[PDB]
Ligand binder design. Structure first.
Ligand SMILES: *[C@@H]1O[C@H](CO[C@@H]2O[C@@H](C)[C@@H](O)[C@@H](O)[C@@H]2O)[C@@H](O[C@@H]2O[C@H](CO)[C@@H](O[C@H]3O[C@H](CO)[C@@H](O)[C@H](O)[C@@H]3O)[C@H](O)[C@H]2NC(C)=O)[C@H](O)[C@H]1NC(C)=O
Ligand SMILES: *[C@@H]1O[C@H](CO[C@@H]2O[C@@H](C)[C@@H](O)[C@@H](O)[C@@H]2O)[C@@H](O[C@@H]2O[C@H](CO)[C@@H](O)[C@H](O)[C@H]2NC(C)=O)[C@H](O)[C@H]1NC(C)=O
Ligand SMILES: *[C@@H]1O[C@H](CO)[C@@H](O)[C@H](O)[C@H]1NC(C)=O
Ligand SMILES: *[C@@H]1O[C@H](CO)[C@@H](O)[C@H](O)[C@H]1NC(C)=O
Length: 326
């Protein structure tokens, strides 16, 4: 008689018992859903004779977990520290996340799992490779070293290193690949024909030992004057002495290294092996000049056939050097 209606549904709460109508004298209890609280706690109400439920002061509000916006040496992604939500973590470079990467604020107003910490990445003292020595290494964290620190070895004399010489601290707390130092010796160098070779005094020549070369008065070197033991047991290079050329004409203007020179004065003491010049030849049809090349190879140089060196006396004839380019 003059029943009460179904109670109002209010945010984040439950009503018990939930019926569609109530007799006067029946009781209902409002509770905030788990994870929410409210000033004054529950509300109980009794359906009165009027059939009208009283006013409901229920204030259902999500719990809040402790402030968690500051992760020393790292970064929290968050919207709000309220009951439904989760937050996630990362760390600045040189640091790792010691703990879980995300946390959740639970019904009990607690973070689970517990908030993490960023710790500095460190690598243990590095092992020294066989036949090596630490040239530079200073640990920045007691006996250990921090991220991106480096150390480098050098081998002992007569030993050749394979792979980069420095190692650095990875983000995973280990070091990069280590060098290998082996012993390497090469054979003796060959003395060159018409030349000499000098190298130090000992039964066996090892890595980065240096031998130097020379040539007699009419010959010059084919390669570098100095050579050394490479890491693979042979030599930098193995040069020979080749024969210079006599200048093949009496008077002619040629291109040596992009500039016109007079071959008789530029090579007054001979053309060296490998010296290349370009002679001037006359296209008759087009009344002009063009150039063909000639190179001194082991005492032999071959002037192009088209070339005609005019007599000193015959002044009328004009050298291809003086005729306009084609
Ligand atoms: C220095 O540490 C690196 C860290 O990677 C790993 O993480 C450690 C914490 C440990 O848990 C273990 O997983 C490794 O040590 C080493 O990295 C190597 O290189 C790859 C990339 O990091 C990787 O490998 C995987 O993938 C490749 C092909 O893509 C596969 O060939 C291999 O089977 C793996 O699935 C892996 O991280 C690791 N692999 C190997 C073979 O080492 C790194 O080796 C190490 N350096 C030294 C000198 O110790
Ligand atoms: C010095 O020796 C290296 C090593 O190559 C050699 O080749 C083997 C067949 C044998 O001769 C061994 O003594 C060495 O293993 C030479 O490096 C080589 O260079 C060319 C380039 O392609 C070729 O022969 C090989 O690919 C290279 N070697 C390897 C192992 O791949 C080098 O040229 C030699 N000479 C000098 C002056 O360094
Ligand atoms: C770091 O190394 C030292 C030796 O230099 C040694 O006493 C110990 O292993 C480390 N330091 C301390 C205080 O234990
Ligand atoms: C490898 O060695 C070279 C020459 O020693 C050096 O410049 C380079 O930095 C090394 N590699 C890396 C990744 O540092």
């Amino acid at each position: 008689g003059r029943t009460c209606p179904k109670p109002d549904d209010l945010p984040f709460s439950t009503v018990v018992p939930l019926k569609t109508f109530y007799e006067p004298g029946e009781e209902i209890t409002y509770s905030c859903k788990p994870g929410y609280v409210s000033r004054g706690g529950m509300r109980k109400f009794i359906c009165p004779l009027t059939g009208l439920w009283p006013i409901n002061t229920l204030k259902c509000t999500p719990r809040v977990c402790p402030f968690a916006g500051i992760l020393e040496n790292g970064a929290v992604r968050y919207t709000t520290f309220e009951y439904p939500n989760t937050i996630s973590f990362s760390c600045n470079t040189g640091f790792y996340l010691n703990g879980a990467d995300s946390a959740k604020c639970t019904e009990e107003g607690k973070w689970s799992p517990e908030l993490p910490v960023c710790a500095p990445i460190i690598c243990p003292p590095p092992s020294i490779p066989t036949f090596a020595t630490l040239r530079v290494y200073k640990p920045s964290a007691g006996n250990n070293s921090l991220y991106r620190d480096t150390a480098v070895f050098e081998c002992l004399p007569q030993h050749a290193m394979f792979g980069n010489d420095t190692i650095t601290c990875t983000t995973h707390g280990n070091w990069t690949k280590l060098p290998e130092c082996r012993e390497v010796k090469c054979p003796f160098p060959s003395r060159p024909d018409n030349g000499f070779v000098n190298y130090p005094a000992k039964p066996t020549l090892y890595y980065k030992d240096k031998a130097t070369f020379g040539c007699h008065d009419g010959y010059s070197l084919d390669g570098p004057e100095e050579i050394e033991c490479t890491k693979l047991g042979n030599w930098s290079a193995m040069p020979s002495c080749k024969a210079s050329c006599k200048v093949p004409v009496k008077k002619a203007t040629v291109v040596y290294q992009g500039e016109r020179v007079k071959i008789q004065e530029k090579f007054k003491n001979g053309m060296l092996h490998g010296d290349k010049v370009s002679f001037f030849c006359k296209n008759k049809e087009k009344k002009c000049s063009y150039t063909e090349d000639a190179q001194c190879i082991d005492g032999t140089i071959e002037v192009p056939k088209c070339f005609k060196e005019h007599s000193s006396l015959a002044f009328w004839k004009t050298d291809a050097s003086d005729v306009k380019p084609c």
